[PDB]
Design an enzyme around this catalytic site. Structure first.
Site, PDB file in Angstrom:
ATOM      1  N   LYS A   1     -27.131  -7.445 -35.039  1.00  0.00           N
ATOM      2  CA  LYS A   1     -28.142  -7.306 -36.140  1.00  0.00           C
ATOM      3  C   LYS A   1     -29.458  -6.687 -35.752  1.00  0.00           C
ATOM      4  N   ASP A   2     -29.983  -7.147 -34.506  1.00  0.00           N
ATOM      5  CA  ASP A   2     -31.247  -6.540 -33.882  1.00  0.00           C
ATOM      6  C   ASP A   2     -30.965  -5.052 -33.775  1.00  0.00           C
TER       7      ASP A   2
ATOM      8  N   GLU B   1     -59.042   2.824 -40.874  1.00  0.00           N
ATOM      9  CA  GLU B   1     -57.740   3.003 -41.138  1.00  0.00           C
ATOM     10  C   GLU B   1     -56.932   1.953 -41.928  1.00  0.00           C
TER      11      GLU B   1
ATOM     12  N   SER C   1     -35.551 -21.730 -33.958  1.00  0.00           N
ATOM     13  CA  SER C   1     -36.118 -21.050 -35.365  1.00  0.00           C
ATOM     14  C   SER C   1     -36.041 -21.910 -36.540  1.00  0.00           C
TER      15      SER C   1
ATOM     16  N   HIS D   1     -39.184 -21.436 -28.286  1.00  0.00           N
ATOM     17  CA  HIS D   1     -38.160 -21.883 -27.495  1.00  0.00           C
ATOM     18  C   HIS D   1     -38.094 -23.464 -27.338  1.00  0.00           C
TER      19      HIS D   1
HETATM   20  C1  HEM Z   1     -47.385  -8.876 -30.893  1.00  0.00           C
HETATM   21  C2  HEM Z   1     -47.132  -9.434 -32.032  1.00  0.00           C
HETATM   22  C3  HEM Z   1     -45.999 -10.339 -31.972  1.00  0.00           C
HETATM   23  C4  HEM Z   1     -44.794 -10.224 -31.406  1.00  0.00           C
HETATM   24  C5  HEM Z   1     -44.236  -9.321 -30.378  1.00  0.00           C
HETATM   25  C6  HEM Z   1     -44.197 -11.739 -32.050  1.00  0.00           C
HETATM   26  C7  HEM Z   1     -42.808 -11.602 -31.413  1.00  0.00           C
HETATM   27  C8  HEM Z   1     -42.150 -12.990 -32.208  1.00  0.00           C
HETATM   28  C9  HEM Z   1     -40.662 -12.915 -32.081  1.00  0.00           C
HETATM   29  C10 HEM Z   1     -39.673 -11.998 -31.098  1.00  0.00           C
HETATM   30  C11 HEM Z   1     -40.231 -14.017 -32.912  1.00  0.00           C
HETATM   31  C12 HEM Z   1     -38.837 -14.718 -32.869  1.00  0.00           C
HETATM   32  C13 HEM Z   1     -37.972 -13.870 -34.047  1.00  0.00           C
HETATM   33  C14 HEM Z   1     -38.651 -13.972 -35.397  1.00  0.00           C
HETATM   34  O1  HEM Z   1     -38.562 -14.836 -35.925  1.00  0.00           O
HETATM   35  O2  HEM Z   1     -39.286 -13.018 -35.979  1.00  0.00           O
HETATM   36  C15 HEM Z   1     -41.499 -14.676 -33.213  1.00  0.00           C
HETATM   37  C16 HEM Z   1     -41.436 -15.695 -34.140  1.00  0.00           C
HETATM   38  C17 HEM Z   1     -42.792 -16.146 -34.836  1.00  0.00           C
HETATM   39  N1  HEM Z   1     -43.747 -15.425 -34.704  1.00  0.00           N
HETATM   40 FE1  HEM Z   1     -44.264 -14.106 -33.950  1.00  0.00          FE
HETATM   41  N2  HEM Z   1     -44.982 -12.129 -32.945  1.00  0.00           N
HETATM   42  C18 HEM Z   1     -46.012 -11.670 -32.994  1.00  0.00           C
HETATM   43  C19 HEM Z   1     -47.174 -11.759 -33.772  1.00  0.00           C
HETATM   44  C20 HEM Z   1     -47.158 -13.073 -34.622  1.00  0.00           C
HETATM   45  C21 HEM Z   1     -48.188 -13.464 -35.499  1.00  0.00           C
HETATM   46  C22 HEM Z   1     -49.360 -12.492 -35.752  1.00  0.00           C
HETATM   47  C23 HEM Z   1     -48.072 -14.734 -35.949  1.00  0.00           C
HETATM   48  C24 HEM Z   1     -48.609 -15.287 -37.278  1.00  0.00           C
HETATM   49  C25 HEM Z   1     -49.891 -15.277 -37.260  1.00  0.00           C
HETATM   50  C26 HEM Z   1     -46.387 -14.991 -35.613  1.00  0.00           C
HETATM   51  C27 HEM Z   1     -46.031 -16.097 -35.824  1.00  0.00           C
HETATM   52  C28 HEM Z   1     -44.706 -16.246 -35.396  1.00  0.00           C
HETATM   53  C29 HEM Z   1     -43.883 -17.458 -35.951  1.00  0.00           C
HETATM   54  C30 HEM Z   1     -44.383 -18.495 -37.016  1.00  0.00           C
HETATM   55  C31 HEM Z   1     -42.501 -17.244 -35.306  1.00  0.00           C
HETATM   56  C32 HEM Z   1     -41.488 -18.288 -35.707  1.00  0.00           C
HETATM   57  C33 HEM Z   1     -40.719 -17.929 -37.034  1.00  0.00           C
HETATM   58  C34 HEM Z   1     -39.485 -18.784 -37.381  1.00  0.00           C
HETATM   59  O3  HEM Z   1     -38.586 -19.632 -36.670  1.00  0.00           O
HETATM   60  O4  HEM Z   1     -39.150 -18.746 -38.465  1.00  0.00           O
HETATM   61  N3  HEM Z   1     -46.146 -14.042 -34.643  1.00  0.00           N
HETATM   62  N4  HEM Z   1     -42.528 -13.708 -32.990  1.00  0.00           N
HETATM   63  C1  HEM Z   2     -50.437  -2.192 -29.223  1.00  0.00           C
HETATM   64  C2  HEM Z   2     -50.441  -1.140 -28.434  1.00  0.00           C
HETATM   65  C3  HEM Z   2     -51.378   0.255 -28.888  1.00  0.00           C
HETATM   66  C4  HEM Z   2     -51.963   0.574 -29.930  1.00  0.00           C
HETATM   67  C5  HEM Z   2     -52.047  -0.162 -31.540  1.00  0.00           C
HETATM   68  C6  HEM Z   2     -52.364   1.689 -29.948  1.00  0.00           C
HETATM   69  C7  HEM Z   2     -53.345   2.503 -30.980  1.00  0.00           C
HETATM   70  C8  HEM Z   2     -53.581   3.795 -30.752  1.00  0.00           C
HETATM   71  C9  HEM Z   2     -54.122   4.620 -31.908  1.00  0.00           C
HETATM   72  C10 HEM Z   2     -54.218   4.326 -33.533  1.00  0.00           C
HETATM   73  C11 HEM Z   2     -54.725   5.641 -31.319  1.00  0.00           C
HETATM   74  C12 HEM Z   2     -55.202   7.006 -32.129  1.00  0.00           C
HETATM   75  C13 HEM Z   2     -54.044   8.003 -32.448  1.00  0.00           C
HETATM   76  C14 HEM Z   2     -54.642   9.043 -32.966  1.00  0.00           C
HETATM   77  O1  HEM Z   2     -54.871   9.155 -34.285  1.00  0.00           O
HETATM   78  O2  HEM Z   2     -54.180  10.209 -32.361  1.00  0.00           O
HETATM   79  C15 HEM Z   2     -54.347   5.760 -29.989  1.00  0.00           C
HETATM   80  C16 HEM Z   2     -54.639   6.781 -29.100  1.00  0.00           C
HETATM   81  C17 HEM Z   2     -54.473   6.764 -27.612  1.00  0.00           C
HETATM   82  N1  HEM Z   2     -53.514   5.682 -27.312  1.00  0.00           N
HETATM   83 FE1  HEM Z   2     -53.094   4.183 -27.995  1.00  0.00          FE
HETATM   84  N2  HEM Z   2     -52.215   2.435 -28.652  1.00  0.00           N
HETATM   85  C18 HEM Z   2     -51.417   1.164 -27.957  1.00  0.00           C
HETATM   86  C19 HEM Z   2     -51.217   1.278 -26.711  1.00  0.00           C
HETATM   87  C20 HEM Z   2     -51.450   2.143 -25.624  1.00  0.00           C
HETATM   88  C21 HEM Z   2     -51.378   2.370 -24.285  1.00  0.00           C
HETATM   89  C22 HEM Z   2     -50.548   1.231 -23.653  1.00  0.00           C
HETATM   90  C23 HEM Z   2     -51.873   3.499 -23.782  1.00  0.00           C
HETATM   91  C24 HEM Z   2     -51.903   3.811 -22.350  1.00  0.00           C
HETATM   92  C25 HEM Z   2     -51.564   3.525 -21.430  1.00  0.00           C
HETATM   93  C26 HEM Z   2     -52.546   4.228 -24.730  1.00  0.00           C
HETATM   94  C27 HEM Z   2     -53.038   5.406 -24.970  1.00  0.00           C
HETATM   95  C28 HEM Z   2     -53.675   6.154 -25.743  1.00  0.00           C
HETATM   96  C29 HEM Z   2     -54.334   7.516 -25.501  1.00  0.00           C
HETATM   97  C30 HEM Z   2     -54.440   8.217 -24.500  1.00  0.00           C
HETATM   98  C31 HEM Z   2     -54.934   7.986 -26.870  1.00  0.00           C
HETATM   99  C32 HEM Z   2     -55.506   9.103 -27.257  1.00  0.00           C
HETATM  100  C33 HEM Z   2     -54.374  10.102 -27.438  1.00  0.00           C
HETATM  101  C34 HEM Z   2     -54.279  10.338 -28.990  1.00  0.00           C
HETATM  102  O3  HEM Z   2     -55.223  10.410 -29.908  1.00  0.00           O
HETATM  103  O4  HEM Z   2     -52.920  10.386 -29.546  1.00  0.00           O
HETATM  104  N3  HEM Z   2     -52.299   3.414 -26.139  1.00  0.00           N
HETATM  105  N4  HEM Z   2     -53.892   4.625 -29.932  1.00  0.00           N
HETATM  106  C1  LIG Z   3     -34.313 -13.783 -34.574  1.00  0.00           C
HETATM  107  O1  LIG Z   3     -34.650 -14.606 -33.642  1.00  0.00           O
HETATM  108  C2  LIG Z   3     -34.766 -14.485 -32.549  1.00  0.00           C
HETATM  109  C3  LIG Z   3     -34.808 -15.715 -31.693  1.00  0.00           C
HETATM  110  C4  LIG Z   3     -35.581 -15.647 -30.416  1.00  0.00           C
HETATM  111  C5  LIG Z   3     -35.782 -14.346 -29.727  1.00  0.00           C
HETATM  112  C6  LIG Z   3     -35.662 -12.892 -30.428  1.00  0.00           C
HETATM  113  C7  LIG Z   3     -35.388 -13.369 -31.915  1.00  0.00           C
HETATM  114  N1  LIG Z   3     -36.070 -11.929 -30.263  1.00  0.00           N
HETATM  115  C8  LIG Z   3     -36.522 -11.586 -28.830  1.00  0.00           C
HETATM  116  C9  LIG Z   3     -36.826 -10.284 -28.713  1.00  0.00           C
HETATM  117  C10 LIG Z   3     -38.098  -9.653 -27.860  1.00  0.00           C
HETATM  118  N2  LIG Z   3     -37.863  -8.373 -27.846  1.00  0.00           N
HETATM  119  N3  LIG Z   3     -36.755  -8.019 -28.782  1.00  0.00           N
HETATM  120  C11 LIG Z   3     -36.454  -6.563 -28.938  1.00  0.00           C
HETATM  121  C12 LIG Z   3     -36.432  -5.974 -27.544  1.00  0.00           C
HETATM  122  C13 LIG Z   3     -37.691  -5.326 -26.991  1.00  0.00           C
HETATM  123  C14 LIG Z   3     -37.650  -4.450 -25.914  1.00  0.00           C
HETATM  124  C15 LIG Z   3     -36.487  -4.714 -25.012  1.00  0.00           C
HETATM  125  O2  LIG Z   3     -36.553  -3.880 -23.913  1.00  0.00           O
HETATM  126  C16 LIG Z   3     -35.632  -4.212 -22.436  1.00  0.00           C
HETATM  127  F1  LIG Z   3     -36.269  -3.672 -21.639  1.00  0.00           F
HETATM  128  F2  LIG Z   3     -34.496  -3.866 -23.039  1.00  0.00           F
HETATM  129  F3  LIG Z   3     -35.571  -5.562 -22.543  1.00  0.00           F
HETATM  130  C17 LIG Z   3     -35.278  -5.286 -25.388  1.00  0.00           C
HETATM  131  C18 LIG Z   3     -35.511  -5.984 -26.622  1.00  0.00           C
HETATM  132  C19 LIG Z   3     -36.125  -9.063 -29.183  1.00  0.00           C
HETATM  133  C20 LIG Z   3     -36.620 -12.716 -27.961  1.00  0.00           C
HETATM  134  C21 LIG Z   3     -36.944 -12.456 -26.429  1.00  0.00           C
HETATM  135  C22 LIG Z   3     -36.365 -14.076 -28.335  1.00  0.00           C
HETATM  136  O3  LIG Z   3     -36.269 -15.294 -27.434  1.00  0.00           O
END
Ligand code: HEM
Ligand code: HEM
Ligand SMILES: COc1ccc2c(c1)N=C(c1cnn(Cc3ccc(OC(F)(F)F)cc3)c1)C(C)C2=O
Ligand SMILES: CCCCCCCC/C=C\CCCCCCCC(=O)OC[C@H](COP(=O)(O)OCCN)OC(=O)CCCCCCC/C=C\CCCCCCCC
Ligand SMILES: CCCCCCCCCCCCCC(=O)OC[C@H](COP(=O)(O)OCC[N+](C)(C)C)OC(=O)CCCCCCCCCCCCC
Ligand code: HEC
Ligand SMILES: CCCCCCCCCCCCO[C@@H]1O[C@H](CO)[C@@H](O[C@H]2O[C@H](CO)[C@@H](O)[C@H](O)[C@H]2O)[C@H](O)[C@H]1O
Ligand SMILES: CCCCCC(=O)OC[C@H](COP(=O)([O-])OCCN)OC(=O)CCCCC
Ligand code: FES
Lengths: 74, 239, 64, 196, 378, 99, 59
Positions: free
Chosen positions: E226-227, E270, E204, E200
């Site tokens: 759109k979202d 995986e 973008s 921000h």
């Molecule tokens: C948990 C993972 C992530 C979340 C929740 C997240 C969230 C977001 C959101 C909501 C935006 C704005 C909307 C968009 O342009 O898509 C954004 C933009 C961006 N994210 Fe992520 N992001 C994640 C991971 C990453 C990763 C892994 C990268 C790069 C290695 C990355 C790089 C960027 C960049 C460069 C932008 C700006 C895009 C533009 O303005 O064209 N993010 N991210």
């Molecule tokens: C980025 C977020 C997360 C990822 C990527 C993730 C990923 C995974 C994956 C790949 C498994 C194995 C699924 C299966 O083969 O059964 C798993 C299992 C599990 N996850 Fe998560 N997890 C996330 C967040 C969480 C959170 C926030 C909790 C609890 C607060 C949670 C609780 C569990 C539990 C209890 C299991 C075992 C039950 C099962 O096998 O389905 N996870 N998670």
């Molecule tokens: C394309 O360009 C942009 C530019 C700017 C932004 C963006 C996209 N999307 C955002 C964004 C983050 N999450 N989401 C999806 C979403 C997930 C959970 C949720 O739960 C709630 F409890 F209801 F709030 C609501 C929405 C959208 C943000 C913050 C943001 O500043």
């Protein structure tokens, strides 16, 4: 930065219609189909060639693994 | 160490919206009961699980009462044996895995609860294994107590061909051929591994329909709002 | 008595099957003829069964 | 001059209803809004149906699973308990006393003094069937298992602190505050009882 | 004089969600950020509900997961939503990164680097999640992968036994993996808010790679609508897996309980790690292989320094476009090779694909930028 | 000279001309370019502003101009060169002086 | 003849309060109709396969 502080623009007019006065899908297939073909033809031999190559290296390597595991006539 | 993978049999539950044949499940259970349950355990299935699937409450109560199970302790502090109830699980043949090995010449017969889900090919695989037992080809012999199956990995298995013609009479009077007996037991083993099957697919249909409605509606809403910008004309008028 | 062994025969009399059967019988009387070679005939049997059981699958269920 | 500006032709984009430039758009405005707002309203009814299902499933998750409901009820056979004697079972991890009562025990517990008791309850409203009394075998004060056909009042007695229960399960002489616990049950056929 | 710009909490919502100036022309590739957010919330909810029924004790662990699927009300739909939800996450992640690479969004340095951190933390979370069911692939996967750290000279062997809390992957390992898997999503949540906080500062990027200050539209309603449509499409993809093929993106061997004796035939992580698993197996030396697996991901931090082109986006750059789609196809090849046994010719293909991966990033795509410049008299 | 054949081909392949953009419209904005833009005369600046606006509006629609309207290779003026060259020349003098 | 969409607007959609009451009523009538209708489609597709269909044989 908010609206009002973005950048400087001069002498540009913009006309537009209310969404209640207009259609959501004007000439959707009529003009849509040819525009899609244009977009597809433009990028095809940038995007497609590597994935053709993957398909070939995949199908080659798969049945090469099969041949190798068969017995040799000697 | 070559490999022969199973073919794709046209199961009554193969399709996207196709349910399990529950009368086939009722037969298949009996194929586990009469044939498998003295060698393989099936730990995650209880007698209550059968109710509203292939048996009634009263039928499943009778099936449960038929088997022995340990319970205790009691007032005097002793472990006794009692008739089973609906809350009891399907009983293990042996007390432990080490006992199981001794009974099958070193081999440990796998638990069948998830066998469809734990093998590549599923019910297609198991059906091919059960019906695919044949005499070995020329130049081939394994150690006494290892049979020839072309579908098993490494071409040699330690299970005696368990199913044959007329192996057990069925409750509904279906002719018990080897192919019929394998088909039924596979249908049961599918439900064992995945009880959710029928609900899951009912939900699938309802999801596809709701998506069929909501996706073009929300897409129309998108086009409506965006129509202000899509239509617009720009004019550059420098003096 | 079994619908299975009926269909296994029906499919066996196809050109893809009978050509694979002949291949099986060539090494049958080639390993047996030779004395002392570690080579066997698993490969040829599996080639056969693959072609046979693919056909069996397509119409076995009809009788069940 | 700014009078040289004339608004571009929007014919291609217009709705059919507003194409005619010599007619007033006001007739069609009622309709045009109606159509677009219907799309929004339909969408919301659909999303309502979906969200209801997702939420209500997640709520269901936290309620009792199939295996906890399996131990909820226990069946007892009434011809297996001899008139006069007590018989005990395991129910929700705790003893459960069912007692067939004689015509002597019915009449003797009927004409007891209601006021003299620590916890005033009459017999006719502690149970349904007169010939049958069902109770949890947990002592109310500090938790023991009462021994049947013993004590001063001829019912249940406790060797922990010094409680005496009658044949109806009510506290008569002891440190216990409340009477032995009456569970929720119903008779099915005349031969069977389900508790729970 | 509204209470959207006035109220301390509404102010943050109004400026980052409603009145945010957005480029008029951002494509479908900009939806993945929002969708990553949805994925994160979805995992946390379904996860929390699973944690209400699970136990991290080695004896009861596998049983508890099955107890969810069999006895807990709608526990199966929760369970398979969480497992396929993890896949949907990684699809969303690689698409999100691809966008950044093609359109050069990585010039936003801080935003980008925080991204790399986010990716790494999601990877760490998912690695420890797949262990929790305590099946074959769970146990044997965790054993091999962790034990790679022993390849570090002097300290490595100690380090491995400290992570484990013993001499193998046992009871102490599973319980701590449950604790880290619970906490990390919430740390991701925080890092994600810092991610956006830096975005921000600039706003973008768009497909042209040319500044869009002359044509900004407000986020509401244009991008809020759109979202919603995008979210709806994500739910379709997820539910198509959950209700029609819930086991398609997994492996069967995780349906039999963990056995420290009986080894699975071809042990593999995986699908979303397979590309990097293949790079590891390319190098014959073990410490070399570990350093290559680490550099296969960390190279993302190098990308902004390797930028040569005078244009920001690849839109107006044919040579780069082809090399980009080559890099994508190569990654698909590494994923395939990752799933294969170590034999002819999978060895040779894997080696050649791994060489091509680093060759594309470190030499070919930088040269291509410079050739493009000199074609434009630049 | 001889490579003018490839330069003309690449120009059309790259294809910014189909949006009615000149080459200097596509240059990535760093600190030097920002200053170069800031130093443009009223006419040259407002033209740049419109051309980009036009391109962004076309990009939004996923469309291109009619072939008649496309920027011809020969007609592509290098409008930003003299401003940008001097901005860089200036900076290199300050960088030199600081050593 | 005020068109049907126009009738819908004047009677249901104009006041936001009535617009919301419409959605709540409509959602009730939709749920029962959709569920009953979709279940019929499923059970016809799987005729004689389900416990619901073979129940009568053991009662
Ligand atoms: C948990 C993972 C992530 C979340 C929740 C997240 C969230 C977001 C959101 C909501 C935006 C704005 C909307 C968009 O342009 O898509 C954004 C933009 C961006 N994210 Fe992520 N992001 C994640 C991971 C990453 C990763 C892994 C990268 C790069 C290695 C990355 C790089 C960027 C960049 C460069 C932008 C700006 C895009 C533009 O303005 O064209 N993010 N991210
Ligand atoms: C980025 C977020 C997360 C990822 C990527 C993730 C990923 C995974 C994956 C790949 C498994 C194995 C699924 C299966 O083969 O059964 C798993 C299992 C599990 N996850 Fe998560 N997890 C996330 C967040 C969480 C959170 C926030 C909790 C609890 C607060 C949670 C609780 C569990 C539990 C209890 C299991 C075992 C039950 C099962 O096998 O389905 N996870 N998670
Ligand atoms: C394309 O360009 C942009 C530019 C700017 C932004 C963006 C996209 N999307 C955002 C964004 C983050 N999450 N989401 C999806 C979403 C997930 C959970 C949720 O739960 C709630 F409890 F209801 F709030 C609501 C929405 C959208 C943000 C913050 C943001 O500043
Ligand atoms: C698929 C087809 C396709 O996308 O190709 C078309 C092409 C044309 O784009 P422009 O040049 O912007 O448009 C010109 C005017 N229309 O569109 C794109 O390039 C799409 C944007 C690229 C998305 C990247 C794909 C993501 C998947 C790859 C993962 C890479 C991960 C690497 C991490 C390790
Ligand atoms: C019950 C909830 C209904 C409350 C509500 O009216 O908001 C729904 C929104 C806004 O719709 P919108 O069409 O903007 O408002 C209609 C205005 N009216 C009544 C004067 C004609 O419409 C939505 O965006 C919700 C549907 C998307 C999910
Ligand atoms: C008296 C012994 C015995 C009987 C009867 C028996 N099994 Fe088994 N089964 C075994 C043994 C021993 C193994 C392990 C074989 C091995 O690993 O080589 C086994 C293995 C299996 C496997 C695993 C194959 C694989 O892919 O690894 C399946 C599936 C199976 N049995 C199903 C059945 C079914 C279905 C029946 C009857 C309807 C049955 N069994 C009857 C002893 C038996
Ligand atoms: C119609 C044409 C048919 C195509 C012919 C294909 C089969 C004939 C062999 C072609 C050459 C490839 O041969 C293959 O090369 C690789 C790559 O070094 C070898 O791989 C070997 O050396 C590399 C060197 O880094 C080691 O990492 C690896 O541990 C080792 O196995 C294989 O052992 C060999 O089998
Ligand atoms: C209580 C309901 C909350 C709510 O949904 O508000 C956001 C908008 C509707 O409000 P608006 O901005 O159209 O109007 C508010 C100004 N009165 O919803 C949309 O995105 C509509 C898109 C079609
Ligand atoms: S504990 Fe038995 S009455 Fe106090």
């Amino acid at each position: 930065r908010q609206f009002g502080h973005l950048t400087r623009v001069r002498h540009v007019i913009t006309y537009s219609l209310s969404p209640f006065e207009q259609r959501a899908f004007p000439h959707y297939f009529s003009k849509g189909i040819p525009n899609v073909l244009r977009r597809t033809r433009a990028c095809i031999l940038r995007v497609a060639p590597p994935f053709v190559a993957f398909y070939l290296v995949y199908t080659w390597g798969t049945q090469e693994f099969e041949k190798s595991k068969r017995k040799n006539p000697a | 160490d070559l490999e022969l993978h199973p073919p794709s049999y046209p199961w009554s539950h193969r399709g996207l919206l196709s349910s399990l044949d529950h009368t086939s499940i009722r037969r298949g259970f009996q194929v586990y009961k009469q044939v498998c349950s003295s060698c393989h355990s099936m730990d995650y299935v209880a007698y209550r699980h059968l109710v509203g699937v292939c048996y009634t409450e009263d039928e499943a109560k009778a099936l449960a009462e038929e088997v022995e199970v340990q319970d205790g302790p009691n007032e005097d502090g002793e472990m006794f044996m009692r008739p089973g109830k609906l809350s009891d699980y399907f009983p293990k043949p042996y007390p432990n895995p080490e006992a199981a090995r001794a009974a099958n010449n070193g081999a440990l017969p796998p638990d069948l609860s998830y066998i469809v889900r734990a093998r590549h090919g599923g019910e297609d695989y198991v059906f091919s294994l059960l019906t695919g037992y044949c005499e070995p080809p020329t130049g081939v012999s394994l150690r006494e107590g290892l049979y020839f199956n072309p579908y098993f990995p490494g071409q040699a298995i330690g299970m005696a061909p368990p199913i044959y013609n007329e192996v057990l009479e069925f409750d509904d009077g279906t002719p018990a051929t080897m192919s019929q007996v394998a088909k039924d037991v596979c249908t049961f083993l599918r439900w064992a591994a995945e009880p959710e099957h029928d609900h899951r697919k009912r939900m699938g249909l309802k999801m596809l329909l709701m998506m069929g409605l909501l996706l073009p509606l929300v897409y129309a809403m998108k086009r409506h709002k965006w129509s202000v910008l899509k239509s617009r004309k720009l004019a550059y008028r420098p003096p | 008595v079994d619908p299975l062994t009926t269909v296994r025969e029906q499919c066996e009399q196809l050109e893809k099957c009978v050509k694979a059967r002949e291949r099986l019988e060539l090494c049958d009387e080639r390993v047996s003829s030779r004395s002392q070679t570690e080579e066997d005939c698993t490969e040829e049997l599996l080639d056969f069964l693959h072609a046979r059981d693919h056909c069996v699958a397509h119409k076995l269920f009809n009788s069940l | 001059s700014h009078t040289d500006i004339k608004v571009p032709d929007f014919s291609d984009y217009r709705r059919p209803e507003v194409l005619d430039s010599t007619k007033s758009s006001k007739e069609s405005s009622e309709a045009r809004k109606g159509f677009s707002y219907l799309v929004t309203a339909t969408t919301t009814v659909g999303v309502a149906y979906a969200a209801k299902n997702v939420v209500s499933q997640f709520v269901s998750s936290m309620s009792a699973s199939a295996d906890v409901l399996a131990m909820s009820k226990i069946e007892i056979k009434l011809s297996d308990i001899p008139e006069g004697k007590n018989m005990a079972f395991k129910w929700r991890g705790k003893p459960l006393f069912v007692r067939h009562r004689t015509k002597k025990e019915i009449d003797q517990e009927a004409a007891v003094e209601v006021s003299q008791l620590r916890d005033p309850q009459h017999d006719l409203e502690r149970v349904k069937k007169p010939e049958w009394v069902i109770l949890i075998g947990v002592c109310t004060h500090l938790g023991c298992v009462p021994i049947a056909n013993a004590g001063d009042f001829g019912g249940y007695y406790c060797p922990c602190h010094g409680s005496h229960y009658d044949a109806s399960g009510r506290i008569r002489k002891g440190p216990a505050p409340l009477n032995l616990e009456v569970p929720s049950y119903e008779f099915t056929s005349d031969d069977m009882v389900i508790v729970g | 004089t509204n209470i959207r710009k006035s109220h301390p909490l509404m102010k943050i919502v109004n400026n980052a969600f409603i009145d945010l100036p957005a480029p008029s022309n951002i494509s479908s590739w900009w939806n993945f950020g929002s969708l990553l957010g949805i994925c994160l919330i979805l995992q946390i909810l379904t996860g929390l509900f699973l944690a209400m029924h699970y136990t991290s004790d080695t004896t009861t662990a596998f049983s508890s997961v099955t107890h969810i699927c069999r006895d807990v009300n709608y526990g199966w739909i929760i369970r398979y939503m969480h497992a396929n939800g993890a896949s949907m996450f990684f699809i969303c992640l690689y698409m999100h990164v691809g966008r950044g690479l093609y359109y050069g969004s990585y010039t936003f340095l801080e935003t980008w680097n925080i991204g790399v951190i986010l990716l790494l933390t999601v990877m760490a979370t998912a690695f420890m999640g797949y262990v929790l069911p305590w099946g074959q692939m769970s146990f044997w996967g965790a054993t091999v992968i962790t034990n790679l750290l022993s390849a570090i000279p002097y300290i490595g062997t100690n380090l491995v036994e400290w992570i484990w809390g013993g001499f193998s992957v046992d009871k102490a390992t599973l319980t701590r993996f449950f604790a880290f898997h619970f906490i990390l999503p919430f740390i991701i949540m925080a890092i994600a808010m810092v991610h956006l906080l830096f975005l921000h500062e600039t706003g973008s990027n768009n497909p042209t790679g040319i500044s869009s200050d002359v044509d900004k539209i407000p986020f509401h309603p244009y991008y809020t609508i759109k979202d919603i449509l995008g979210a709806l499409l994500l739910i379709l993809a997820l539910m198509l897996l959950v209700l029609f093929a819930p086991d398609l993106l997994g492996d069967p061997d995780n349906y039999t309980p963990a056995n420290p004796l009986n080894t699975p035939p071809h042990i593999k992580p995986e699908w979303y790690f397979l590309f990097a698993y293949a790079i590891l197996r390319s190098i014959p030396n073990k410490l070399g292989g570990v350093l290559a697996l680490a550099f296969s991901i960390l190279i993302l931090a190098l990308i902004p320094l390797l930028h040569t082109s005078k244009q920001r986006s690849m839109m107006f750059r044919p040579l780069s476009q082809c090399l980009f789609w080559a890099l994508v196809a190569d990654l698909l090849t590494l994923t395939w090779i990752g799933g294969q046994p170590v034999e002819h010719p999978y060895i040779t293909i894997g080696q050649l694909a791994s060489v091509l991966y680093f060759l594309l990033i470190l030499v070919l795509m930088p040269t291509a930028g410079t050739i493009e410049n000199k074609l434009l008299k630049w | 000279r001889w490579l003018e054949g490839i330069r003309k081909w690449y120009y059309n392949a790259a294809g910014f001309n189909k949006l009615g953009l000149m080459r200097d419209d596509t240059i990535h904005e760093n600190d030097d370019v920002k200053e170069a833009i800031r130093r443009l005369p009223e006419n040259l600046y407002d033209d740049r502003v419109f051309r980009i606006k036009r391109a962004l509006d076309l990009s939004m629609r996923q469309q291109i101009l009619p072939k008649e309207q496309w920027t011809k290779y020969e007609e592509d003026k290098s409008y930003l060169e003299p401003y940008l060259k001097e901005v860089i020349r200036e900076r290199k003098e300050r960088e030199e002086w600081a050593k | 003849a005020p068109t049907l969409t126009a009738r819908l607007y004047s009677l249901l959609f104009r006041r936001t309060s009535t617009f919301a009451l419409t959605i709540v009523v409509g959602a009730l009538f939709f749920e029962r109709a959709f569920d009953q209708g979709a279940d019929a489609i499923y059970e016809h597709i799987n005729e004689g396969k389900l416990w619901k269909h073979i129940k009568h044989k053991y009662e």
